[PDB]
Amino acid sequence: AEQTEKSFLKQPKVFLSTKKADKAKRPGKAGNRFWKSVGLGFKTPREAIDGTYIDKKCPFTGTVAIRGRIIAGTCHSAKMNRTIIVRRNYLHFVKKYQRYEKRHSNIPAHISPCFRVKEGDHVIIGQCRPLSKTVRFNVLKVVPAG
């Protein structure tokens, strides 16, 4: 079902054709789906542990690590393959007038199939290595608007 590419898609360093298969072993062993806790107090979604998708850029089942900044925001666009635009809204202080002005930043973030998101949801992203030209963040937690 997940094999939608011109290539087979496998989790790196997981031997699927193992003969001594076992489910009591740790993830990635005996043909088990690999997954990890990203750390920083973030729970691993159960749909990543029980998923069948293959995403190398997934924070929980892929090869990327979360290190650096942790940024909150709102889903501003979700029209790309596994990538969403996160809009951050903040107040910029103007020194001379002692006032604030509203400013925004559009941060591209990779979203793994373990989350389904819609424009307007509150998301938490964590900094990772560069994944594309503009993406340096991975969605870590999605809070729906309602």
Partner: protein, 186 residues
């Protein structure tokens, strides 16, 4: 020369970026090895950053291949390139790249299987160990039907243009079924 810099790209907004510096050597790229499957082995020494060595295979005909379920690794001849997921140009040109699907000689694996299991696909100790191994022995009949022709489907897991070698694993299981469907659809 070939560069890897973000200078020449457009911005994410679409705006053009005016250059503020010439190309640095620490951001170069080199021309692809374009490793061909041929019995005229040529691997060239590439001097890289730090005075280190990169091995650039131009023509290769032999590789180190692992049969993961059997946990055995043998040196086998490369016979043909059959499937590439990025470009069939690389299939017709017989270009060896990482994740290419190739035909490899099955003779070393047949020999090892006969020696280790006693089964073709003289002592009490030898026969006892052979019967112990033969108990629970299970092949998957797809590897068997390609053993009949003497050619095993394999995936090149090494990068020939970087390490100068064409190494890989023998395809098994779901990956094997996927690539057999791809090759029959070809």
């Amino acid at each position: 020369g070939i560069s890897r810099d973000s200078m020449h790209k457009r911005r994410a907004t679409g705006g053009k970026q005016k250059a503020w510096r010439k190309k640095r050597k620490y951001e170069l790229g080199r021309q692809p090895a374009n490793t061909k499957l041929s019995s005229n082995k040529t691997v060239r020494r590439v001097r890289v950053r730090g005075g280190n060595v990169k091995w650039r295979a131009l023509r290769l005909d032999t590789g180190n291949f692992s049969w993961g379920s059997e946990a055995v690794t043998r040196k086998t001849r490369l016979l043909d390139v059959v499937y590439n997921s990025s470009n069939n140009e690389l299939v017709r040109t017989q270009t060896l790249v990482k994740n290419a699907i190739v035909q490899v000689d099955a003779a070393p694996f047949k020999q090892w299987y006969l020696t280790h299991y006693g089964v073709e696909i003289k002592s009490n100790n030898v026969q006892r160990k052979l019967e112990k191994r033969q108990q629970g022995r299970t092949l998957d009949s797809h590897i068997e039907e390609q053993f009949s022709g003497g050619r095993l489907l394999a995936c090149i897991s090494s990068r020939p243009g970087q390490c100068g070698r064409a190494d890989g694993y023998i395809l098994e299981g779901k990956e094997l079924e996927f690539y057999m469907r791809k090759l029959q659809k070809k």
